[PDB]
Amino acid sequence: HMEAVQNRIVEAAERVPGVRGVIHLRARYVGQDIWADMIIGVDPENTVEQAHEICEAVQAAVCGKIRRIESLAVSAEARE
Amino acid sequence: HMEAVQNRIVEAAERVPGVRGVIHLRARYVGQDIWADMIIGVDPENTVEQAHEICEAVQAAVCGKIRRIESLAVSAEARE
């Protein structure tokens, strides 16, 4: 339900080039809308700029696929 | 007072190689202890691993200089 929506968020994030898994996802309803914050893994040898580009790509992929999301923050952490 | 402690935190962070300013600092007292979270700027062309190393260096510099800090989280963002 919410679990259904979280699964969709993870799946959509994992399909973006450069994502090394979803490390963390917190999602909540504000009325009928979802507000979420997530942390993605990235290659430690990517540049900070590349990691920012991946996060922005995730934000666009996820919000394009899951139309109820009205706020999404995406950060990155090194992951082997 | 608290302003004195914040100034010390910023100064100590700015003295670590690789810091391109303090972007954000939130500090609060939990009893006599300080708990703080901060965001440092870094070179967009540093690797994610390098940025992690800078953040860890900041955590060590700051907590070494300001002994009342009992919790400090340090994250990075690209800054030109």
Swiss-Prot record, chains A, B:
Fe cation 2 binds at residue 52. Fe cation 3 binds at residue 77. It comes from the Bacteria. Signal peptide: none annotated. Residues 3-80 are annotated as: C-terminal domain (CTD). Disruption phenotype: Single gene disruption has no growth defects, no accumulation of magnetite, forms empty intracellular magnetosome vesicles, decreased levels of MamB, mislocation of MamC in 1-3 foci or rarely in a shortened chain. Magnetosome vesicles are fewer and smaller, aligned in a chain with the filament, only a few have very small crystals. Other, possibly precursor magnetosome vesicles are visible. MamI mislocalized to cell inner membrane or in 1 to a few patches. It is found in: Magnetosome membrane; Cell inner membrane. Fe cation 1 binds at residues 37, 73. Induction: Part of the probable 17 gene mamAB operon. Belongs to the cation diffusion facilitator (CDF) transporter (TC 2.A.4) family. The C-terminal domain (CTD) is probably responsible for hetero- and homodimerization; it assumes a V-shaped, dimeric metallo-chaperone-like fold that can open and close. Val-48 forms the hinge between the dimers. Binds up to 3 divalent metal cations (probably iron in vivo); upon binding there is a conformational shift to a tighter dimer. If the CTD cannot fold correctly the function of the whole protein is decreased, suggesting the CTD confers functionality on the transmembrane domain (TMD), perhaps activated by ligand binding to the CTD. Forms homodimers via its C-terminal domain (CTD) in the presence of metal cations. Interacts with MamB via their CTD. Isolated CTD forms homodimers. Essential for magnetosome formation; required for stable accumulation of MamB. May nucleate iron crystal formation. Probably binds and transports iron. Binds divalent cations, possibly up to 3 Zn(2+) per dimer in vitro, probably iron in vivo. One of 7 genes (mamLQBIEMO) able to induce magnetosome membrane biogenesis; coexpression of mamLQRBIEMO in a deletion of the 17 gene mamAB operon restores magnetosome vesicle formation but not magnetite biosynthesis. This bacteria makes up to 60 cubo-octahedral magnetosomes of about 45 nm in diameter which contain membrane-bound crystals of magnetite (Fe(3)O(4)). Expression of just the minimal mamAB gene cluster (MGMSRv2__2365 to MGMSRv2__2381), including this gene, is sufficient to form a minimal magnetosome chain with small magnetite particles. This is Magnetosome protein MamM. It comes from Magnetospirillum gryphiswaldense (strain DSM 6361 / JCM 21280 / NBRC 15271 / MSR-1). The chain holds residues 215 to 292 of 318 of the full protein.
